[model samples]
Target chain A: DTGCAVSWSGKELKCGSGIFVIDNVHTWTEQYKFQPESPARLASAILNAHEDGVCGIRSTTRLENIMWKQITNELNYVLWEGGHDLTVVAGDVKGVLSKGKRALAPPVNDLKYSWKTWGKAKIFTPEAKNSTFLIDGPDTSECPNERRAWNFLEVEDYGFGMFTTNIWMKFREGSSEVCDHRLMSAAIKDQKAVHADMGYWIESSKNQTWQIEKASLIEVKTCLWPKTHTLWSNGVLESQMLIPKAYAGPFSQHNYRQGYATQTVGPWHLGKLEIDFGECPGTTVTIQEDCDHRGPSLRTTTASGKLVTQWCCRSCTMPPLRFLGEDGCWYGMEIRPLSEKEENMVKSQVSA
Target chain B: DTGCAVSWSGKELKCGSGIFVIDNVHTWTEQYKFQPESPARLASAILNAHEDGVCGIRSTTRLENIMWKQITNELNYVLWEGGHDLTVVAGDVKGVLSKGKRALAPPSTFLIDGPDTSECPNERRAWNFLEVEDYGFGMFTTNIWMKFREGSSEVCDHRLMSAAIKDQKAVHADMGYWIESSKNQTWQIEKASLIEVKTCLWPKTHTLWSNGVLESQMLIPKAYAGPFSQHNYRQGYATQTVGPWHLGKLEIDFGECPGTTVTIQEDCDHRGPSLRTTTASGKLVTQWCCRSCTMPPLRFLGEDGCWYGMEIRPLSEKEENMVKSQVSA
Candidate 1:
């Protein structure tokens, strides 16, 4: 699809490079007669690491206006770590300036994109090789297994306070094979440690508002063999039942609900799942990756063809009345202004 | 004695007419040239006069770093009147820009010297001469034939008030020589008319404060004449005042004094003399130059028989007050 031409008899010549590998080196000189000379240096020292990297590329015209303008655009799908990383990474996504002479048309406009974490993984099972794996979430009829619950608490408030929970269970292979004790233990331990501590390190304010009503885990429940578990409400999401590692070889059952018992029905593989309770004062929930390497294995079974090992824990708090419409209005109408004294009192009580 | 050495490599070339004329037109193009090509036309336009028939022999130098660091200093003493018979005529002064370039300085300073009627015939006095000549002044006594007393009502509290008086006595002299009978009659009528008018144009407010409180006439006297009348204030006393034109041709019967009455002593010549006045009050009263003119001929007749004239004038009130000092408590 490529072409090349040359006018050998004192005319012009044209050429093009097809898909082929070639090595190239760049050379620059102050004079027209190309010769080796001192290289150009930056006018000033770059301080920040990110700025230095950008400048290094900029010096070579790599991250110049051309490429730098698109940096933000390219960074849309990537996660940002706050400080300079976020700024520089966002810059790259926006791309660089173009070589066009007209300056009015800027190289980057709405090209830079926002950061987001999307998509979720699933665990599969094959007793359901011919049938679909059913996830029996939270139900009062089914027996449960080990569970973990998190709560957001006010420092001076009573009891377990506002909370949310998740269910953790074992992975099974139909009615014959089950996840090994070691793998099960490791997965449970990892999930437990991460949920209890590592989760806090990553996003502690998810449940408790800490300095402003900190959120902490209240309880956990577990089950063995048939594999199921339930979580209580510190704030929302009362019960959740699921089997871990449902796809690999074993089949386990799982289910979830707000305020009821739950049990497994068919074989399934549950990679890992956790419920997220945000601090905003409304019904908000999300299910995402969760793993713990601490709790007991859920593969053990008794003679009755049932798994029996369950635990339940509860978190409590005196419920603060959720505001109705117009109750939590930030300001009254200006025409309906409050007295100066009343305004001052209200201002003092409002959290900054 | 001035002497010079002449050295030339030419073969025995003799000086023509017993004089060696070295007329060299020195010209140099400056590194930063300010004179445009059409200099003659431009300069003519700038000076508002044509350059033809107008030439002067003077020194010029382009000074560097003079003012705001812009133009070259074309410093020259230029004589800029048109054509020959041009008189010693009109000229520029040196050290003008350097001495805070005054618009008025010699050779263009006070204007021209007088066209002496006693010497030149068909003499049409140039405007410049009439201008500078009026600034020349002297004094005379009251006992003289021509007596000038500042008009009685002329004594003003603030500035000088001058008015011409009627001719009470007609002396037997050649009045027809300088003034025609018709001109005298016209002047007399005009003087009477102005006297009747009694108009004070420069009525200063200070007059109210000083009225009757001080001898206004003595405190402030008529200083100088106008440009055209300055020469009339002087006496042409050449050769011991015995020249053909000198009317008071005798010896010095009277002497100079601090305050003197000035009079037109002779008619044929534009001669004036200063007479000592015991009642005048001030010493060596100086004539102030008119506002239009710059230089004033300042003459001092000391007791030592020394008559000296310099181009100097009185300082302004602000200048005088600024120099005042207090010695002790």
Candidate 2:
């Protein structure tokens, strides 16, 4: 939920249904230096209002300041440039307040009715290069009945230190066929609450060679924060946060943009990855995989050698008594029978 | 208290105040295999009565059975032999029932008194032995009854030996002493109790120049037992219960005859002697003497060597930091 409802009608626009109030106008300016009464400036105002924690805006005269035709032209430029998406809504009122009605400027068409270059020109060669082909174009007759290419480069300022810029290309198989025509582009905004996307489209019709039959879409999403946003006031916002740069090209469609970034300063446990203290002292530590399993067996040299010596036994029939010799080695002794003369001496003593 | 009253008038004796009972005789026989009217037999009966738990005896006729004159001769033999002591008591008495007065045979002098060198005697030399001397006759001469240096060897069994033997010797003037002389001895049998002493005198005025005066006095003390004595059936007469064989000559006197024998099969705590286990697991046990005071020090080779090395400490200004070495040994 955008946390507020918005609606649109023919010309007149109301916001907030009288529930909203303009507590402060912290920022107001014509953001782009070259353009006056610009849709970019309107977007700048709306974004600034959102950042000030303004839930909604509701001046009838202010709502009419957004030129629908220029805003649509700006949106088309964004699409051709392939970097950013824009949204504009107007009309019925709820939870907002308004004052007076005001008129807006009408749409304009800068392009004459001609087979003109709409964006950057590309050239087509006989051999296909990679999966994507880059060409210089607007000189269509040179590659008639073969292929044509075009590229669009634009940087749109959304005001309030937020903007996006990109370059994208489109291709057609032949002068009379559109079956092979495809488009690819990517875009991202430079701001705290970010919006970004990479997109692709395939042409499906011969009705107008430049017209797209199907198109991939992206909606730029934004969130508001008070001037009291913590990271900014702490003077660590630049060091702590990272925003990815926008990519725009035919191949940029395959770029994998990670959504978030994380880092840790010390050892961390994840699944079977474990950290343990070393057997020796000091700062020694051990890291191991599959911590639940038993560790490798250890065999010392002295112990193994002692075992080998003990295994070699001989003379099983008359087994000798084993004893530790003076030199720390094992030895054995054998017993012999007594003699008759020795026994007789003992018998004489017993009789006495 | 002998369980009776006793009184003496002149030389006659009355014991038990006329209260006594003769339950059983229990003993009547020739104690020695050869002697009939033997003083040894009489001593045997007296000892038998003592061992029988009989506290004392009383009766005029029964007291007369102890031949005083013969008993004295036997005492003389014990004194001269120098190995035992003896006591005898006798007189008239009441409380004991006797059949009739039986006259004992007269004292007989059966002294074939041969030249007997007795009791582990070694060969004698011509250095005239004069530490102490005994002369036997009706009179005791100081020394002249000697046959010079003739030493005969014999182990005699006196027929009427009734003396208690104990190997405790008394010393006087660094001379060994033994004496004998004819002396009359009288004794009285108290009520179930007895006590006796003997005093001897030598003729200072002698017909021979070896006459003497001043003689030794011996007081013998003995006790009797009744028939119900433990360790004896009917009775037994024991003049001796060996307190272990004498531990050799010189050291024997210093032998601390401990009041009781003690044997500790395992660990024991004796006064200041103590033993304690070591803190680490190995061949390490600590022994301390005089636990109440400072104990004696112990020094092990490696441990003390390490201590010396640590104390030397070459880098005085910037001493090396102490740390455990990696080798387990």
Candidate 3:
């Protein structure tokens, strides 16, 4: 990203196509997708809520109605594992943010979804109401043979929350296939977040019954990182020392260096922060540049080797997830959601 | 070596430049040079004195007067260090074999042989005795400065034992010039033996003087070993297993058998001792060979690798330093 900046408060803000800050609104109102604070204090609360303008640099409508209440708290966390792992708390926002509306219909049930041919698959779940995900647990009554079951919501005595938002689950009791589909607000919880990339079997067997959809949110762009490792956060102290290959070819970036990397420059000269002021019990300078063409000081060999580096010393004390974009190098803070008349001007500012 | 052997006891003897036999009459009668028994009890006292015949298969005069008393106990151990670290043990050899008469005259000292010009050098001692070795243990009085003192026998309360047969020595205390030269009967101990390859810095300084003679007897030969590790004595039990390679490519050399590397083969090949008639509460056979040219049993590629080895199993063992020489294969 050669351009995408944000320094705000001392105002640096730039963006050709990348620069949208405001990270934590409980990182979109938390309901457990890992929120134990500390993303350098959510990048110091989006740089103290974009310098206290009440967290609004762009994308608004109360951050897209807290981004559809972060998609109805992740579809009630995939129906709270058929409701067994239990979760009913959706109460406060002190100013009217909400997770209060879902399932006004669709739950009567007399069940029947037999996959009839090689357990013929059936998938669907587009944008709202009653929910279900079926796969018959087969142990050989042989309907086309093949099974794995556990995604319940039958109810006669059957309690809820296990319809699968998976976390180490395994079930096979008898007869499979059951459904109740329909969902909305903010989707994408194939039991997503925190850990990843495995767990999606669903080719199933048994009695069967189905319906599902709402999955869309997937977009998250901009990563940037590698010039050989430079993304650690929170008052970062960094190391790779013995520097002296000198325009500081080795690299540096101090707020205060008691002592502290590659080409594509700056943790020195081209900017972000540096100010050593001879405070060491010291005086040991070495700053090289000029590999052949754009010279400033570096043309050696009477014996010059053994002081290469990858050093850093960022200490303005806490609050850094990297910033400075407009031409590339910005980090954290982006949101795009709202618009249906911007969710009716954020529900008339929470209905007056 | 493929040929050249010595089995003596149950007689296997094959040769056709290697096997010399008699390895101990005291590995040439000892006086200091890695001796204190155990070379499989001197190869079993050279196979019980070559099976009791008074050790003699050639090279006489009592092994050349005990190889000239192992070169006069290493040049009276480099002149007992200018005769200071003290040593006088030259008493008995019984049958007139001695280190006795080393100085019958050369000590009428009025001293005079200075190294004069670039402080030049002089090296002698070809054969007989009045003994003296000068490099004027120098300590900087200029003229080609390079000081390294301590090799005295000036005999005026100079005792003995530090002349440079080096055992941690460093001397720079004074003057530097005195001679007595003339030595013989056996040389080669510029303070030598047991832990080597360093120690020799004589360039002289201060008031210098010299003389020296006698130093000839350096010629040791024969060291056959390298078939990829087959030299571990005192009743050997060898190892490199899972073997199975056909005309025996892995290797074996047993004296009894219990359980235990590379190409050019034998510590198991054509014989140094192999006798294994099913002893291991078992039977695990695999021995290969032939890699192209001479053909006897190694011509594969279908499913034959994974029991490959450098295995050995020697048991009735006691005396073994490897006796087998005499060809090149």
Candidate 4:
């Protein structure tokens, strides 16, 4: 009984803490937006990460991100709720159980789909032959009003790497009029050893499908003409756009977005990837230089009658889905290792 | 190399450092009433006196009596000045020379001259006497004013002390009108010891001379009162007053003046006395308080905009008054 602190028979070895609860308790008049980890917990998480040789995450990522992930991992098995009463239990499982299987094979040529408006089509990838795992037709979908449920082909190790070169995407959306257009091309590889590089060129008109040209890459870091705006239209190549300080972390290269509309569509390029350093102690990956498309695209007038640009990501962290345990609740057991004295304390306080 | 600190040879003690300069100049735009010795000084002074067995003198005799006789007998010298600067030195030095002199003689006193304004019709005596040291007849003159001019009184110290008294001694021109006309013959000794006693009497009026009642024990710290139109009418016999925290000091007393024109006169009872203990190492005795008529009375306005009353005495510190000393200038 002492050798392994058991939550259940098989799940005991991988057990730690459980879900951090954040409840929406109060009515609209007295609303509260609670997070599982308090500010103090978040601070401690960042400090812990720093100590663990995490050089940094994405340059554009804020401390909030680091805090969220850090505390989540830290209290993974410790169940807690922010408001009112919330509890956890042990042993009563239900889900898509592989019925005692040892290993589940990776799905071949898997496809995950999501709906999006045509105006937001920045990158598109479709399933194809030869490279069944590769992506195609990640091209722009300019269908106005029509919601397209598109799929992303996922690959192993390299992650959900989209492998498409050129394909026809939706050009115009309206049943009567078609003008708005944008481009989503294959990302250039080998440019940087760690990540791929790509871009979008969007042009909109009143009558025809929006004019979109294949976006090109210029490998520089400074603006060629600081005072002039002609560099984008003219042949003169400018220096690499200066990434703002807010976007300078480890995952910066893969996550940072530019352009206003490009932001709402999401900043990440090929679906998603989990890059493992492959070492015993893995390197931490984070988003740096995450940005929104520059002015004009994000600009809009407010009720106060003032024009403002929505050039920044409204929110950054993704909502974490529940991971169920044997108990009816997602979190019903503690996984953190404890001392003999701590074990004694918990045992004496709880009924078997 | 340093015998007696270069002996008092009529030479100035030149500062080793060049002309003293206080840098880091800060300016105060509004009037600043600064007490060189903060509140701590009073407590320190009292503790020094109590531990050292020092006797503090308080009397109401004319200023000339204490200056020439007791102060001179103790300090061996005395000074006279029109304004107040030089007298403070004299008063301070008198305190120094009075060390261990309590056995030699007791403090002297005088009867309150009931009807003397300019000239006292009494003979000079070592223990009790009076003379015409100065002349003034309603042209803003009194015995208190003359003594002040002859000795340089410390205006700041005197002002602080006066503010402590109950029925403060007000001044007209430079003379403290102790016998002022008031409706009630009530005078209270505005002191830290017994400030709860109020005033309720007034002085009787006359054209030729201001009437005086029995003078209180030589600066034993008592208050005075009078009718609305008479001078020096009542003394603090009946108790009916309020004591303020601001007046809680051994050396000085402060009172809220409201609309009444009470004079802040110096205590003229006794000269400086000696310390019995060695608590305050440097100075043997310090002039913590003085009586108005006991020494030459000098009057001035304090930085607090209140009237200051104190006796002026000649500087006895021979070194400071020497020809080579710029201070003597």
Q: What DockQ score does model 2 reach against the true complex?
A: 0.00
Off by over 4 Å in 4: A1-352, B1-58, B61-74, B77-329
Q: How big is the positional error of residue B5 in model 2, measured in Å on the Cα after superposition?
A: 43
- What candidate 3 gets wrong by more than 4 Å, as runs, is A1-100, A103-106, A116-352, B1-329
For candidate 1, write residues A133-178 as lDDT tens digits. Answer: 1112221122121111111000121121124212122112132222
- For candidate 2, write residues A153-190 as lDDT tens digits: 11232232224222221211122211111211122223
Question: What TM-score quantifies how close candidate 1 is to the native fold?
Answer: 0.13
For model 3, the docking class works out as incorrect
Candidate 2 chain A, poorest ten consecutive residues by summed lDDT: A263-272
Report the C-alpha lDDT of model 4 over B119-212, residue by residue, as the tens digit.
3221221111111233334322222222112222211112111111123342211011122222233442232222111121122221112344
TM-scores for all candidates: the values are 0.13, 0.12, 0.15, 0.15
Docking tier of model 4: it is: incorrect
Alpha-carbon shift of residue A205 in model 3 (angstroms)? 49
Worst 10 residues of 1 chain A by lDDT: A34-43
**Candidate 4: RMSD over Cα atoms?**
31.9
- Alpha-carbon interface RMSD for all candidates, in angstroms: 40.5, 66.2, 39.9, 42.5
